Design a protein around this ligand. Structure first.
Ligand SMILES: *[C@@H]1O[C@H](CO)[C@@H](O)[C@H](O)[C@H]1NC(C)=O
Ligand SMILES: *[C@@H]1O[C@H](CO)[C@@H](O)[C@H](O)[C@H]1NC(C)=O
Lengths: 49, 50
């Protein structure tokens, strides 16, 4: 924890380093899950499948 | 923080770019200008500067 009457953290724009306001106070991090796109490498239909 | 955005790595790494630059440097030092116009022909550097 940092100070009593102001606890909800946020580092730059949207990290929001707190759940909302835990009764136990105190904050660790924010990273539930974060994943990106996909792509497919293909040598060509007429060559293989 | 993964806000719907991502960066893709460059196709050539910094090490490979450095290797390309070093190859160009070695070619232009030990072979003058001919290595860019066919096979690399060695030539002593003072004569190249001449
Ligand atoms: C219950 O409230 C008290 C407040 O001091 C504290 O122990 C904690 O925030 C809450 N939870 C538990 C398990 O005590
Ligand atoms: C694929 O490869 C075959 C054999 O080389 C060729 O005949 C054909 O024109 C190529 N393209 C397609 C769309 O099949």
């Amino acid at each position: 924890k940092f100070l009593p009457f102001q606890q909800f953290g946020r580092d730059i724009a949207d990290t929001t380093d707190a759940v909302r306001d835990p009764q136990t106070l105190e904050i660790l991090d924010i990273t539930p899950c974060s994943f990106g796109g996909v792509s497919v490498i293909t040598p060509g239909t007429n060559t293989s499948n | 923080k993964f806000n719907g955005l991502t960066v893709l790595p460059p196709l050539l790494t910094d090490e490979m770019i450095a290797q390309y630059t070093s190859a160009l440097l070695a070619g232009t030092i030990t072979s003058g200008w001919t290595f860019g116009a066919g096979p690399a022909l060695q030539i002593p550097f003072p004569m190249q500067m001449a």
